[PDB]
Amino acid sequence: SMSQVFFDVEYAPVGTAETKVGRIVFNLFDKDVPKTAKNFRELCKRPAGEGYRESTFHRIIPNFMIQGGDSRKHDKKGILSMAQFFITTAVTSWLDGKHVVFGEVADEKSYSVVKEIEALGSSSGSVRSNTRPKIVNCGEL
Amino acid sequence: MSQVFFDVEYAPVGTAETKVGRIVFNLFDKDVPKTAKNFRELCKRPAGEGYRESTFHRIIPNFMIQGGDKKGILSMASQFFITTAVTSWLDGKHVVFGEVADEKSYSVVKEIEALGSSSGSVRSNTRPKIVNCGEL
Numbered sequence: 001s002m003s004q005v006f007f008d009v010e011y012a013p014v015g016t017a018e019t020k021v022g023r024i025v026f027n028l029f030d031k032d033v034p035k036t037a038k039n040f041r042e043l044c045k046r047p048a049g050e051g052y053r054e055s056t057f058h059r060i061i062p063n064f065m066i067q068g069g070d071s072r073k074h075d076k077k078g079i080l081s082m083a084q085f086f087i088t089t090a091v092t093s094w095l096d097g098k099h100v101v102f103g104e105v106a107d108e109k110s111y112s113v114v115k116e117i118e119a120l121g122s123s124s125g126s127v128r129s130n131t132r133p134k135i136v137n138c139g140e141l
Numbered sequence: 142m143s144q145v146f147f148d149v150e151y152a153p154v155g156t157a158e159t160k161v162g163r164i165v166f167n168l169f170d171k172d173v174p175k176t177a178k179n180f181r182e183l184c185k186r187p188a189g190e191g192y193r194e195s196t197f198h199r200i201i202p203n204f205m206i207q208g209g210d211k212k213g214i215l216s217m218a219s220q221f222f223i224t225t226a227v228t229s230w231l232d233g234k235h236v237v238f239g240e241v242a243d244e245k246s247y248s249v250v251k252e253i254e255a256l257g258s259s260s261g262s263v264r265s266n267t268r269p270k271i272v273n274c275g276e277l
Contacts, residue, residue, distance in 0.1 A: 002155045003226070006169070014229075015208070024223070026215055027214075036217055039219075040215075040217070061204070062186050062203065063201045063225065063226060064204060064224065064225060064226045065223065065224045065225070065226075065241070066158065066200070066222070067223075068220075068223075069219040069220045069221045070219065070220045074240070077240065077247060078240060078241025078246070078247055078250055079237055079239070079240060079241075080166055080168075080237070080238060080240060080241070081235045081236060081237050081238065081251055082176050082179070082180065082236045082238055083229065083233070083234070083235040083236070084207065084208075084209040085180065085207070085208050086205060086206070086207050086208075086227065086235070087206040087207075087208075088204065088205050088227075089203065089204060089205070089241075089247070089250060089251070089254070090203065090205075092227075092230075093229060094218075094222075094242040095227065095235070096228065097231070097232060097233060097234050097235070098232070099217065099218055099222065099232050100216060100217045100232065101215070101217040101231055101233040102215055102216065102217060103214075103215035104212060104213060104214050104215060105212070105213030105214075105223065105225075109224075110213070111211055111276040114213045114223055114225060115225070118225065121181050123204070
């Protein structure tokens with residue numbers, strides 16, 4: 001309940017052939033959403049093939065999102081939204097106000113890694129890299 | 142049922158000369174009448190009270206323009222997301238009320254997006270400005 005969780009992610013940054021392993025550390029909100037944070041921690045610890053270790057990032061959009069742990073043409077043409085207005089030209093329909101927020105990237109180095117990984121995506125969320133980013137380790141710090 | 146437009150003044154990335162590009166939108170007035178009405182009203186108000194003379198404050202290349210602290214949020218829809226932009230939309234509401242109407246308009250949007258940065262900070266010392274707005 002008090003520990004941070006981390007992902008070690010293997011990926012080849014944009015413009016290079018060589019893979020690296022970058023760490024993303026997260027602060028979880030176990031007090032706010034105990035069952036959701038608990039499930040994540042449990043999935044982090046399970047053996048490769050049953051949890052997050054050895055899973056990959058399926059959809060990635062630069063400067064926006066990474067999706068792991070598992071219309072578009074219209075969104076890409078330009079959507080106007082009110083929240084202040086926004087014009088978006090990347091896939092946004094997956095952002096439906098129904099998510100359960102359960103943590104946050106903890107530090108600047110981790111945030112840099114997230115940005116680096118996000119650069120491997122595209123407006124549709126399709127991963128451009130040949131090397132699909134893979135979680136090679138996960139655990140608690 | 143009319144389309145609405147913005148004429149936006151900006152200098153394309155890497156150039157000093159400003160141009161005016163038009164972005165035309167189709168609004169979904171039947172889906173969300175009150176939201177579309179508010180936008181149309183603000184389009185028609187005088188500068189200082191409406192969109193005319195307002196600027197685009199945050200812009201991300203190939204992704205977003207926003208008008209009218211870095212954080213990476215972790216959320217669940219075992220599927221999880223790490224989101225670093227428009228994070229309020231994860232568990233907060235946003236109302237889709239329109240679309241960019243045509244290819245020329247889309248090209249203008251793309252040009253304007255190019256003036257942003259990864260953080261959303263506008264690179265240019267002069268923000269893109271809505272010089273005219275109205276209905277077609």
